[PDB]
Amino acid sequence: VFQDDPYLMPASSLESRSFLLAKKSGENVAKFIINSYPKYFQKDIAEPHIPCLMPEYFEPQIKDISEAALKERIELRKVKASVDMFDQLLQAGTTVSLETTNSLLDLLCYYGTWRAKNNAERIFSLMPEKNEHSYCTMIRGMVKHRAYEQALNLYTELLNNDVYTFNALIEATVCEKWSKILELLRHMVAQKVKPNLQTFNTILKCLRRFHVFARSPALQVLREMKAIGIEPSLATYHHIIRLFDPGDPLKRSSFIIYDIMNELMGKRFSPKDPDDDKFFQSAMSICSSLRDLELAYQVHGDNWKFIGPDQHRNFYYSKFFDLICLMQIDVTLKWYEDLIPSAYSQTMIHLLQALDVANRLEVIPKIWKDSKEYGHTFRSDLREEILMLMARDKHPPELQVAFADCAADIKSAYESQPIRQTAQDWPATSLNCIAILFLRGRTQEAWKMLGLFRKHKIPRSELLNELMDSAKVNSPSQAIEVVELASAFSLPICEGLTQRVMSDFAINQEQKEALSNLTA
Amino acid sequence: SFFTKLTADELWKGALAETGAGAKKGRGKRTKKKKRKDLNRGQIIGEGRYGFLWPGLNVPLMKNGAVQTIAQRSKEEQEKVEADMIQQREEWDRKKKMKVKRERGWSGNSWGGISLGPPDPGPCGETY
Amino acid sequence: NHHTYAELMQTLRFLGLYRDEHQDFMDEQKRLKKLRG
Amino acid sequence: NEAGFDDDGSEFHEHIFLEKHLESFPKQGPIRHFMELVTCGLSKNPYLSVKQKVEHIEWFRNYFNEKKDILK
Amino acid sequence: KNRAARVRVSKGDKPVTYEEAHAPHYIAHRKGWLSLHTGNLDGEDHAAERTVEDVFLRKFMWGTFPGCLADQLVLKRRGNQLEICAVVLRQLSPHKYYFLVGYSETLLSYFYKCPVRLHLQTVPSKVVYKYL
Amino acid sequence: RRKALPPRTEKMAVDQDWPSVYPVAAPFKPSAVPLPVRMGYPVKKGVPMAKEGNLELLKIPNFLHLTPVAIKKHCEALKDFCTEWPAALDSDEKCEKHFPIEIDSTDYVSSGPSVRNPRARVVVLRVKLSSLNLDDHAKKKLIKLVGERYCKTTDVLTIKTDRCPLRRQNYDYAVYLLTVLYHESWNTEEWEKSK
Amino acid sequence: VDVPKDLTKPVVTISDEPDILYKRLSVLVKGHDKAVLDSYEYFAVLAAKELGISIKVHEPPRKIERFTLLQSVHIYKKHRVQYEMRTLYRCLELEHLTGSTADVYLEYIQRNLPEGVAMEVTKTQLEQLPEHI
Amino acid sequence: HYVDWRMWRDVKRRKMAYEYADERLRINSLRKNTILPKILQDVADEEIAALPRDSCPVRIRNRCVMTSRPRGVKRRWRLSRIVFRHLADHGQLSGIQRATW
Amino acid sequence: EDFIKKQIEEFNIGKRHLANMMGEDPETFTQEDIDRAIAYLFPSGLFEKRARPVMKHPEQIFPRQRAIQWGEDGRPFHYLFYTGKQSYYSLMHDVYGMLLNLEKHQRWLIKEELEEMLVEKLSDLDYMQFIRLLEKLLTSQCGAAEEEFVQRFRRSVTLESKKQLIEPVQYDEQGMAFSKSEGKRKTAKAEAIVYKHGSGRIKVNGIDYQLYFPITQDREQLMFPFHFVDRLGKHDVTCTVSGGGRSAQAGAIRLAMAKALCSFVTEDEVEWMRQAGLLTTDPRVRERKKPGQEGARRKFTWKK
RNA sequence: GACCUGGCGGUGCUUCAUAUCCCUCUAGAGGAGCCUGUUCUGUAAUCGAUAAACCCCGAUCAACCUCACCACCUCUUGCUCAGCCUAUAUACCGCCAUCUUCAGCAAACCCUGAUGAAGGCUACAAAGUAAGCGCAAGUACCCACGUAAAGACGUUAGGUCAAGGUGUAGCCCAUGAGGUGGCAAGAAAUGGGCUACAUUUUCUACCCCAGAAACGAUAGCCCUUAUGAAUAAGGGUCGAAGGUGGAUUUAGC
Ligand SMILES: [Mg+2]
Ligand SMILES: [Mg+2]
Ligand SMILES: [Mg+2]
Ligand SMILES: [Mg+2]
Ligand SMILES: [Mg+2]
Ligand SMILES: [Mg+2]
Ligand SMILES: [Mg+2]
Ligand SMILES: [Mg+2]
Ligand SMILES: [Mg+2]
């Protein structure tokens, strides 16, 4: 969906989101222009007539109560229905058809809040003829758009006089209630409805949180589901996996569910429940807590559509790469360097600590360069982390050139942004390792950089060590005009200068030695 | 017609008439010269008569972390935009056409007492 | 039909997306003419 | 080149053989001559379908039935 | 002296690209055709309609991506599917770029009742063939 | 303000799935293509234009997709679906023996939104009368009826069909015409007996 | 490393009725670039080889049409400007070819066209005699 | 928004000819037939004479689409020679070469 | 300057990529392979190779440019540098030194070739000076290194054949030897079989010449090959023809008969026939008619 | 008064002239008729180019639209967020003739002339160096030759606001728009092409071995047919001017 050139190449999750949202907004603008000026695109130049390409017609026809009623279910709104009820009740006083009244009630309950109150209190004027369909759709509406006492009253009225109707009724009853839940389940199973288990899914959704006294009975309820043999175990299974949430991991149940989802993966899947999108995200959320790599590989035909939203995809990939990092890591970095362009701070931090524990120093540069190429700019948390981890090292002598290069790039990025004020406190935190790496070939750069640092300070023990190594690595005056100044500045450089002045520094001139004596 | 319309540069050439008879021989004309102008650079691509608010090009796409929606600029706001764009164009044209004050040297219409500033730097580098 | 073509392009200019150079020229000189009488 | 535009499942003989569409005139007359040549040309023409051919035929029917004044 | 799809030789301060630098008698010899269709070949038809529609396409897209393009377009019509290729500059935002891409693609598809796709190649500054 | 990342040239490895990175037909995309291939008239003491701004590589048709590796892949994939021709059919004479009635249609395909074109309707067919008629009176009658639809040098009777717009209309009308022609050549008349 | 486990295969059904027998598939490609035609025919012959069928190649001559126009606008009859449309032909014939093989091969090629080319199929199929005769 | 009033008139003539193309051919055949009555031929003649103006496909002209130039237009491309040369020089169209033979 | 090495290494990497693409071991790989690969993967109807797509090696893409001839400071390296033409000046210097050494002891190369061998241009005048100096050197004796210096510049003569090809004889049933040949013309193309053992009559499309050419000049042209060779009634020939013009077909059959008989007759007689000039296709064809002209060459009358 | 540059010389010397100067070679135009343009006559009845570098020119089409002229009759926001074939090609863009059947044109440096306009060449070499364009080369046809293509800077304020658009000046009940009609003939001069004026001719079958005659209408009258709602080819008759060209002139290796 994204373009190929590098400039248009979306190099971050938020900007990519905004980009394809702008594309969708252009699609909506196209819809608006076509449905505002249909006559322009009315020409059917293409030989195969396609209603997908034909302009769209939400235009009410002339006043015609019967055809207007038939067009009600075509226009998909509520003002037309109000006007039609008005025309049929006030002056006509007749019903075009009970099916038409049922469809009107369907639409009005779907559309639903004082407006919902008015829409629900304006349906009782409907002609006496109100069958089950009408009553149970009123229940549907009062449940999924308003409070639950009204739905309960309507259900009692119906009893005095469907699968997802009773589903909504159970939702209303539930949303501690032990006897309620029990009698509900009992009479529901007693009736001959034979639900599609969406009632069970909804009662699970309501049981999202409870102790073992309903977490464990869910297992036998699922075993009964399996015995009747209806459920694919797509959503209720995942919801009980989530309900397992937790002061202590349950390794036994974890292994059991591992085998279960293993055979579920082995078999082929077909979608039936609209809530299979939270499946992916919360499943990987539980996987992250579990921390297992064979588990991650198991969780990894066209079942990749259930990821959907970029937020859930982000959570999944983040937890996946985090587990893979915190698991050698050669195969992990292989998988990563394979999926980085397709895939999208915390992940990079985990990568840095994984590379540290691995000791693969040569890899971190390329990773930092990739992050910078994509979106890593105007933030120094990861810069601090990489600098500390890379200059805790000095063991590669030839790699000091790469140290200097990446340090120069890091400083080029660090000094970009004055107006923001955020670049002022970055050197105070991470300039020490940067300057040490610069010292480790080129030295004048690090010299003047430490000058700028101290002339911005927060001295440090490794800063003292840096100053000492720099001074000892031939030029007395060039070393003095730095070490003596930093000593006059602060006391630890002075207690180090006490020793520095022995070799060849104090013999040059006494005015700076006099200043040192005064400060000491 | 729209098919009859065409790009700008050839219209500008045909209107300015830099060459073809007038320029040659040095005859020129009697102090009439059409000034060059660029209309595309001036106005942003978004605005028009119908003031639809474009989150893609005209309005920032995201506000308060919420996707925006296509909306209508009322006619009063449309008139405000038209007025301030008229003002902006008038200001641009004012800044375009102005006086030129080369300091009077020996006399008007004479290149005697005017200085062109110091010489240019040399290739090897020699500031004069 | 130039009807459809030019009507679409005029409506889209009024939307303010197609910077029509020829039309900008025409109406700019129209403004100049109506200013100069 | 014919996925769609099926002509409502029309038939080659329905196109070509207009003998059944020609019933209301004898076999020898000049109107028979003209209408025979008409059916010939129509069957020769593939561009137009049975509907167009029958509307041609019925327009000719109306024509000479309103001009039945002569029959010479 | 013939003046046809050529640039007048200037003092050498006029950046010129390949196609507009070279002459129209170098088309098959040292250039390629901007469009590619079969209406020009024998046996086909609708060639006038092809020409009109592609001229309108080029004009509309030039004016709905104004100021960013720096050369003529490339049209590639393989049977039903239409493909467009453009070269543009990188001064405006990718937000606007993608928005106008989708807008124009949807409009072309809805108008011509044909599957349409278009691609764009970014350049910092338009490539120059010579200074004439 | 914004800056574009460097191309995929150094990113792409020497070992790489070109059929995977170019599954279908697509433009050149020099940013993704690592090859420095250039094309353009070089200037005196000069060279062709670099691949990036070389819009003539896009002008020309494109074949970076569908490499020989990709062709091997797709052909050895679709091998499972393709069927086998009967081995008994091994020669022209044996194929025309098994199925004498030859029939052939044709149509163009061209770039554009529309697809219909009247030349789709025409069809023709052929059959040798040396083995089909099995008699002499009907043979003489038929060869007298047909004026130019035959050719005795190669000895095949050939007939076309275009009177109908539909290919199947042409087909079944030709079949019915041949049937009625055989049935009418079977019989005779007194003016035909008198010659 | 990412190699899928189960490759989704299409559904196929072998209907009871027999497949049609094409005697000869003769395809004729009209183009403007001899190099493009050579690449296209090489592609086609390599596909036919890998599918396991007979082949043959030959190049019909180049056809050209030219016509003269007035070089200038108002009054110039001697000075004209000329143009020419060049079409180049290529033929490819395939004999003893099953109906489903024709289907798959034509689907492949028809999806793998280039742009500036026209493709003319001539299909020759044999069949038995009718029943009414 | 056609190019000009003469293009407008030409398009009106084309519309009329298209929407009367059937009856015109029908009665033209009924006229040019010979074996039928001459009185019928004359009635059909006066009917064609009473038919309205701008209804015949003879009054229309194969004019140019861009500049409305009647002369110097190819029936295939429908464009004037000048716009044809313009597009051929600018390389907009496809598969046309200069006849340098 | 580092751009050159970057281009070379990137070209090697792209060559490895292209080898992986086309499916061959990148170890073994050739420039003709590069050419065929680019031709197949990116065809182009452009006629000139310089305009067609080419994936070439950078050393051959870029022409040699004279590198920096003076260090970062001070003097230049070569000693004619303060003037132009330094390399040719030093060349003339050491050439004249070798010349005077010679006198005390006692094909050619193109202007552009020398230009591109050096890194500077020159004039026809000093080019002629160089040529006359070369032949001045060569008119006298020459040592081994001196001859080597001269042949460094001297190139291959590349002489042509100046010969008429000989077709192979053929044998068919009943022990019959013969030779086939083909001739052409403006618009007539024919081919003739000559049978040596046979003699006498002649066939043309299955008809004899006496009645195929009622006019005698065509038969005279048909006899001219046999007449020059002097073998008149000792060879029979058949021939098939496809043409529009009578004299055109006559010339085509004449050329075909001669091109078939040159195989039978000795090389000496082949040379005699080439001297006669009857073994070469006539390149002359009716010129094109021009748009502004009344004909191929005739113009409208100058109206003044 | 003296100088710099160019043009010009019925200006000198030398080398040339490729079908161009001629001597030369051929076939034609200027003879008669016809077709089609130009000038001119009259009409209410377009327009423009109208030496070379227009005259079967815009036109690879005008019986009706094409129609832009004219008589008559109507519309007034008029298909056009108007329109105008109204003027200005001496505002122009766009497109071409011309020398050109040329080969030069030239940013940028230096030098000479006392630092003037201007010039910059001596190859056994004396101040010129040259980006770049063009020529050229290569590309198309059958080649490498040839033909095509290409042929810059600039002259003719060259032609074209009528291919189209556009600056300026105007009509904006009109100088815009719509529907009927005719207009488009020749006392005459001129131009380009066709026909023949003969026996290398005319007729007959074939396209070349024959037999007869001792020619010529593509104009006019009548008729048929082609499409159209309403000029073209064919048939009968008429069977002349015409007897091979006025200086002069055109094209061709
Ligand atoms: Mg003054
Ligand atoms: Mg010319
Ligand atoms: Mg007219
Ligand atoms: Mg007017
Ligand atoms: Mg002028
Ligand atoms: Mg040349
Ligand atoms: Mg030319
Ligand atoms: Mg003038
Ligand atoms: Mg007629």
Swiss-Prot record, chain B:
Superkingdom of source: Eukaryota
Protein name: Small ribosomal subunit protein uS5m
Assembly mode: Component of the mitochondrial small ribosomal subunit (mt-SSU). Mature mammalian 55S mitochondrial ribosomes consist of a small (28S) and a large (39S) subunit. The 28S small subunit contains a 12S ribosomal RNA (12S mt-rRNA) and 30 different proteins. The 39S large subunit contains a 16S rRNA (16S mt-rRNA), a copy of mitochondrial valine transfer RNA (mt-tRNA(Val)), which plays an integral structural role, and 52 different proteins.
Annotated compartments: Mitochondrion
Family statement: Belongs to the universal ribosomal protein uS5 family.
UniProtKB/Swiss-Prot annotation, chain E:
Subcellular location: Mitochondrion
Keyword Lipoprotein: no
GO biological process: mitochondrial translation
Organism: Homo sapiens (Human)
Record has Mitochondrion as a keyword: yes
Full protein: residues contained: 36 to 167 of 167
Record's protein name: Small ribosomal subunit protein uS3m
Gene Ontology molecular function terms on file: RNA binding; structural constituent of ribosome
Keywords assigned by UniProt, alphabetized: Mitochondrion, Ribonucleoprotein, Ribosomal protein, Transit peptide
Family (UniProt): Belongs to the universal ribosomal protein uS3 family.
From Swiss-Prot, chain F:
Principal location class: mitochondrion
CC annotations in GO: cytosol; mitochondrial inner membrane; mitochondrial small ribosomal subunit; mitochondrion
This protein's UniProt keywords: Coiled coil, Mitochondrion, Ribonucleoprotein, Ribosomal protein, Transit peptide
GO biological process, one term: mitochondrial translation
Ribonucleoprotein as UniProt keyword: yes
Gene Ontology terms, MF aspect: RNA binding; structural constituent of ribosome
Signal sequence segment: none
Localization annotation: Mitochondrion
Subunit structure: Component of the mitochondrial small ribosomal subunit (mt-SSU). Mature mammalian 55S mitochondrial ribosomes consist of a small (28S) and a large (39S) subunit. The 28S small subunit contains a 12S ribosomal RNA (12S mt-rRNA) and 30 different proteins. The 39S large subunit contains a 16S rRNA (16S mt-rRNA), a copy of mitochondrial valine transfer RNA (mt-tRNA(Val)), which plays an integral structural role, and 52 different proteins.
Family: Belongs to the mitochondrion-specific ribosomal protein mS35 family.
Protein name in the entry: Small ribosomal subunit protein mS35
The species this protein was found in: Homo sapiens (Human)
Parent sequence residues shown: 49 to 243 of 323
Swiss-Prot record, chain H:
Disulfide-linked positions: none
Keywords: Disease variant, Mitochondrion, Primary mitochondrial disease, Ribonucleoprotein, Ribosomal protein
Gene Ontology MF annotations: RNA binding; structural constituent of ribosome
Biological process (GO), any one: translation
GO cellular component, one term: mitochondrion
Domain of life, per lineage: Eukaryota
Signal peptide range: none
Subcellular location per the Swiss-Prot or TrEMBL entry: Mitochondrion
Family to which this protein belongs: Belongs to the universal ribosomal protein uS14 family.
Disease note: Combined oxidative phosphorylation deficiency 38: An autosomal recessive disorder due to mitochondrial dysfunction and characterized by perinatal hypertrophic cardiomyopathy, growth retardation, muscle hypotonia, elevated lactate, dysmorphy and intellectual disability.
Assembly notes: Component of the mitochondrial small ribosomal subunit (mt-SSU). Mature mammalian 55S mitochondrial ribosomes consist of a small (28S) and a large (39S) subunit. The 28S small subunit contains a 12S ribosomal RNA (12S mt-rRNA) and 30 different proteins. The 39S large subunit contains a 16S rRNA (16S mt-rRNA), a copy of mitochondrial valine transfer RNA (mt-tRNA(Val)), which plays an integral structural role, and 52 different proteins. Interacts with LIAT1.
Protein known as: Small ribosomal subunit protein uS14m
Species: Homo sapiens (Human)
